Every structure is written in C-alpha cells, then in structure tokens.
Design an enzyme around this catalytic site. Structure first.
Site, mmCIF file in Angstrom:
data_model
loop_
_atom_site.group_PDB
_atom_site.id
_atom_site.type_symbol
_atom_site.label_atom_id
_atom_site.label_comp_id
_atom_site.label_asym_id
_atom_site.label_seq_id
_atom_site.Cartn_x
_atom_site.Cartn_y
_atom_site.Cartn_z
ATOM 1 N N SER A 45 74.738 0.876 -58.834
ATOM 2 C CA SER A 45 74.353 0.913 -60.242
ATOM 3 C C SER A 45 74.333 2.313 -60.830
ATOM 4 O O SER A 45 74.174 2.445 -62.047
ATOM 5 C CB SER A 45 72.990 0.254 -60.466
ATOM 6 O OG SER A 45 73.117 -1.171 -60.411
ATOM 7 N N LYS A 48 76.665 3.060 -63.824
ATOM 8 C CA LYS A 48 76.290 2.698 -65.192
ATOM 9 C C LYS A 48 76.150 3.926 -66.129
ATOM 10 O O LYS A 48 76.429 3.830 -67.328
ATOM 11 C CB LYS A 48 75.049 1.803 -65.181
ATOM 12 C CG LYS A 48 75.338 0.450 -64.551
ATOM 13 C CD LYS A 48 74.085 -0.304 -64.174
ATOM 14 C CE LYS A 48 74.450 -1.737 -63.762
ATOM 15 N NZ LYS A 48 73.431 -2.373 -62.862
ATOM 16 N N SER A 105 69.037 -1.410 -65.595
ATOM 17 C CA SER A 105 70.081 -1.743 -64.614
ATOM 18 C C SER A 105 70.687 -3.144 -64.866
ATOM 19 O O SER A 105 71.214 -3.790 -63.964
ATOM 20 C CB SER A 105 69.565 -1.581 -63.161
ATOM 21 O OG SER A 105 70.614 -1.087 -62.335
ATOM 22 N N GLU A 141 80.181 -5.951 -61.861
ATOM 23 C CA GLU A 141 78.921 -6.412 -61.263
ATOM 24 C C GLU A 141 79.033 -7.920 -60.956
ATOM 25 O O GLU A 141 79.581 -8.664 -61.761
ATOM 26 C CB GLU A 141 77.726 -6.126 -62.177
ATOM 27 C CG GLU A 141 77.430 -4.625 -62.334
ATOM 28 C CD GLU A 141 76.725 -4.019 -61.125
ATOM 29 O OE1 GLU A 141 76.369 -2.819 -61.196
ATOM 30 O OE2 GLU A 141 76.474 -4.740 -60.125
ATOM 31 N N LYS A 209 69.144 7.584 -62.802
ATOM 32 C CA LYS A 209 69.655 6.239 -62.643
ATOM 33 C C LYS A 209 69.727 5.949 -61.146
ATOM 34 O O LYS A 209 70.352 6.713 -60.401
ATOM 35 C CB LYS A 209 71.062 6.102 -63.225
ATOM 36 C CG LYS A 209 71.641 4.661 -63.073
ATOM 37 C CD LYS A 209 70.903 3.705 -63.995
ATOM 38 C CE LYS A 209 71.098 2.205 -63.605
ATOM 39 N NZ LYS A 209 70.146 1.715 -62.524
ATOM 40 N N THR A 210 69.129 4.831 -60.735
ATOM 41 C CA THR A 210 69.160 4.385 -59.341
ATOM 42 C C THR A 210 70.247 3.341 -59.114
ATOM 43 O O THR A 210 70.854 2.820 -60.073
ATOM 44 C CB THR A 210 67.812 3.781 -58.921
ATOM 45 O OG1 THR A 210 67.514 2.662 -59.771
ATOM 46 C CG2 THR A 210 66.699 4.845 -59.014
ATOM 47 N N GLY A 211 70.474 3.014 -57.843
ATOM 48 C CA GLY A 211 71.424 1.963 -57.493
ATOM 49 C C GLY A 211 71.071 1.390 -56.134
ATOM 50 O O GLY A 211 70.469 2.067 -55.304
ATOM 51 N N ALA A 212 71.469 0.151 -55.893
ATOM 52 C CA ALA A 212 71.242 -0.453 -54.589
ATOM 53 C C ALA A 212 72.429 -1.353 -54.276
ATOM 54 O O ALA A 212 73.073 -1.898 -55.198
ATOM 55 C CB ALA A 212 69.942 -1.243 -54.583
HETATM 56 C C1 LIG Z 1 67.015 -2.180 -59.953
HETATM 57 C C2 LIG Z 1 68.093 -1.890 -58.913
HETATM 58 C C3 LIG Z 1 67.505 -1.991 -57.496
HETATM 59 O O1 LIG Z 1 69.198 -2.765 -59.135
HETATM 60 N N1 LIG Z 1 68.942 -4.071 -58.970
HETATM 61 C C4 LIG Z 1 69.810 -5.046 -58.903
HETATM 62 C C5 LIG Z 1 71.265 -4.876 -59.008
HETATM 63 O O2 LIG Z 1 71.977 -5.883 -59.058
HETATM 64 N N2 LIG Z 1 71.802 -3.647 -59.073
HETATM 65 C C6 LIG Z 1 73.257 -3.462 -59.155
HETATM 66 B B1 LIG Z 1 73.762 -1.933 -59.088
HETATM 67 O O3 LIG Z 1 73.107 -1.254 -57.879
HETATM 68 O O4 LIG Z 1 75.297 -1.959 -59.193
HETATM 69 C C7 LIG Z 1 69.139 -6.346 -58.684
HETATM 70 C C8 LIG Z 1 69.801 -7.569 -58.557
HETATM 71 S S1 LIG Z 1 68.657 -8.858 -58.322
HETATM 72 C C9 LIG Z 1 67.394 -7.691 -58.404
HETATM 73 N N3 LIG Z 1 66.084 -8.059 -58.280
HETATM 74 N N4 LIG Z 1 67.773 -6.414 -58.600
HETATM 75 C C10 LIG Z 1 68.684 -0.541 -59.123
HETATM 76 O O5 LIG Z 1 69.676 -0.490 -59.870
HETATM 77 O O6 LIG Z 1 68.188 0.425 -58.528
#
Ligand SMILES: CC(C)(O/N=C(\C(=O)NCB(O)O)c1csc(N)n1)C(=O)O
Ligand SMILES: OC[C@H]1O[C@H](O[C@H]2[C@H](O)[C@@H](O)[C@H](OCCCCCCC3CCCCC3)O[C@@H]2CO)[C@H](O)[C@@H](O)[C@@H]1O
Ligand SMILES: C[C@H]1CC(C)(C)OB(CNC(=O)/C(=N\OC(C)(C)C(=O)O)c2csc(N)n2)O1
Length: 265
Positions: A45, A48, A105, A141, A209-212
């Site tokens: 994420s 983004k 996110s 996504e 901005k975080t991501g997982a």
């Molecule tokens: C918030 C956090 C962890 O992202 N959370 C997501 C997610 O789908 N992120 C997609 B990104 O990392 O491309 C998610 C899906 S179901 C759920 N609960 N969270 C992030 O972006 O850090």
C-alpha cells in the site's frame, strides 16, 4: 537502542526475513544511512503515495481535476474499502479518493485512481517519466500484495522509492500546490500516523504511508525530522518472514527508534 544497522541485523535474525532501509535528506537527497537499499521489496500500500503523485501530475497538466466526481458501482469494489463502500450513491471526488487511498489505505479508492492514470502500466510509465527506472506496478489491489519471492511485479527498492518520493515532493516536477497536497495527505494518515505521533519524542514531525502484504511483507514510507520539520525521507520494508503482525510492527518500530535516537546531522 542499538545503532540503526545493528538494530536492522537483530531484526533480520529475529524475523528470518529481509529488511530494506534508507534515510535520505528531503531537500538535497543526501543519503544518511542504508541497508539493502538497492534490493527489491513489494511496495504494497506504500504505492498509494506514488499513485496520487501521478494523479496530481495529471491535474497539473490539465488532464484531471481534484474536484471531478467519480461515480462507481458495488461490482467495482475490492477487499478493504472503508471509505469508498460508503459512497455508492453519491460517488467521490478525485481528491477525496486520494485522501481515502493514502489516509485510510482504501483499496477501491486506489483502484479507481489507478484506472485514471492508465492502470499499473500507466503508473509504471509515469515512474519512467520521472526517471525511476526500477519501481514498477503490474497489478491492482489486492493482488499486488502477493509478495511471491523472486517476483519483480509491484516492487521498488528503498533507494528508488526514496528518490521518487523526493522527486514528487520537492523537485518541482509537480506544481507547488500539488507538492503541498501530496504532503498533506501523508501528514493526515489515519492508519498509523496518530499512533506513531503518540510514541514519538516531542518535536518530531511525522507524515507516512504504511503497507502490508503476504509472507510477512510490511513497510512504511515516511517524512520525519526533529524540530517539527520534514527533514528526511525514511523507507523501511520487510519481506519473507513468518512472524506475527505484532512482531513485524514492533521490529519496524525498533528500527525507527534506532534511526531517531542515532539521527546524524
Ligand atoms: C491498513 C493496512 C495494514 O492495509 N490494510 C489492508 C490492505 O489491503 N492493504 C493493501 B496495501 O498494503 O496494498 C487490509 C485489507 S483487510 C484489512 N483489515 N486491512 C496498511 O495499508 O498498512
Ligand atoms: O534519546 C532520544 C529519545 O529516546 C526515546 O525516544 C524513543 C521513544 O520512547 C519511542 O517510543 C520511539 O519509538 C519510535 C516510534 C515508532 C514509530 C514507527 C517508526 C516509523 C517512524 C518513521 C520512519 C521509520 C518508521 O523511539 C524513540 C527513539 O528511541 C526517549 O523516550 C525520548 O525521551 C528521547 O528523546
Ligand atoms: C500519470 C501519467 C501517466 C501517463 C500514462 C504516463 O500519461 B500521463 C499524462 N498523459 C495522459 O494521461 C494521456 N492522455 O491524456 C489525455 C486523455 C488528456 C490526452 O491528452 O489525450 C496519455 C498518455 S499515453 C496516451 N496514449 N495518452 O499521466
């Protein structure tokens, strides 16, 4: 805390995963410290921010307006759309979509925006235009979080990501107003921003901005500095660890703590 590279080594040993890190002056691009900064990691994420940089570029070109309202359908939604699922009736402006994508996110917000810039291929073309020959987006996504080992799709390196963020925020490739807007959105992150700010020593500026992703992938791109100034870009990615989310968060936090305690002039 240990010296930053000491902490990073402890982190990799404990996680059995790779960490990628860079700390870079925002104004000049001076690299302060780095670890695996030329190795690829899934953006997750964190992409983004780059996406909305591209969107702002289109606004600056007179190809787009932050005011433009996009109306979409339930079938357009993907997993994790906390803001966008609320607006099936009334739609959302391009600016609102960027806000939801960066600060919450929101995945469908991200996909809708991605469509406006020509999909993953268009975002990748934008990156090449700003001289980032490394970062690439290939999927939407949520498939882009797959994090398959040895897969170049949807990856950046810490050094490329930091250089690209600097280019978007300060290089005057984007208009003055657009640079300010991109910054604002990162300052306004609701996922981790308020929590981070709560545990930062007084005086420290934060925007992020975080991501997982899968297989333990986790990361953060941030603007940080003492004296309430966005002095430096910090990128930290983690990949290929079986560890709990709690441990992944804590490790990135400990690396952050190390960088903060051992901040050099
Ligand atoms: C918030 C956090 C962890 O992202 N959370 C997501 C997610 O789908 N992120 C997609 B990104 O990392 O491309 C998610 C899906 S179901 C759920 N609960 N969270 C992030 O972006 O850090
Ligand atoms: O001596 C320097 C400082 O050391 C500690 O501060 C700690 C703080 O108590 C801790 O809560 C934070 O965690 C770091 C915050 C984690 C946030 C995630 C990290 C993000 C930040 C943006 C880029 C990297 C990733 O570390 C700092 C530095 O050791 C002391 O508490 C504080 O009084 C003192 O000013
Ligand atoms: C973020 C970057 C991504 C990308 C794709 C590199 O391009 B830009 C800016 N350019 C365009 O979007 C564009 N058309 O814009 C309109 C439709 C206004 C037009 O002039 O016809 C276009 C690009 S390739 C192609 N065939 N058309 O935004």
């Amino acid at each position: 805390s240990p010296q930053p590279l000491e902490q990073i080594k402890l982190s990799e040993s404990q996680l059995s995963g790779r960490v990628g890190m860079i700390e870079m002056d925002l104004a000049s691009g001076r690299t302060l410290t780095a670890w695996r900064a030329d190795e690829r990691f899934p953006m997750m994420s964190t992409f983004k921010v780059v996406l909305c940089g591209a969107v702002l570029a289109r606004v600056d070109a007179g190809d787009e307006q932050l005011e433009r309202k996009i109306h979409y359908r339930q079938q357009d939604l993907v997993d994790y759309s906390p803001v966008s699922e609320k607006h099936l009736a009334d739609g959302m402006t391009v600016g609102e979509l960027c806000a939801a994508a960066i600060t919450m996110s929101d995945n469908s917000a991200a996909n809708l925006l991605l469509a406006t810039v020509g999909g993953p291929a268009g975002l990748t073309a934008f990156l090449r235009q700003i001289g980032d020959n490394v970062t690439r987006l290939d999927r939407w996504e949520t498939e882009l979080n797959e994090a398959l080992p040895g897969d170049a799709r949807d990856t950046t390196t810490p050094a490329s990501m930091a250089a690209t963020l600097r280019k978007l925020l300060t290089s005057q490739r984007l208009s003055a107003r657009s640079q300010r807007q991109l910054l604002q959105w990162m300052v306004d992150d609701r996922v981790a921003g308020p929590l981070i700010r709560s545990v930062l020593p007084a005086g420290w500026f934060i925007a992020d901005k975080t991501g997982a992703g899968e297989r333990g992938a986790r990361g953060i791109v941030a603007l940080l500095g003492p004296n309430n100034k966005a002095e430096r870009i910090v990128v930290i990615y983690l990949r290929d660890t079986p560890a709990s989310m709690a441990e992944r968060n804590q490790q990135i936090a400990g690396i952050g703590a190390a960088l903060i305690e051992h901040w050099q002039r």
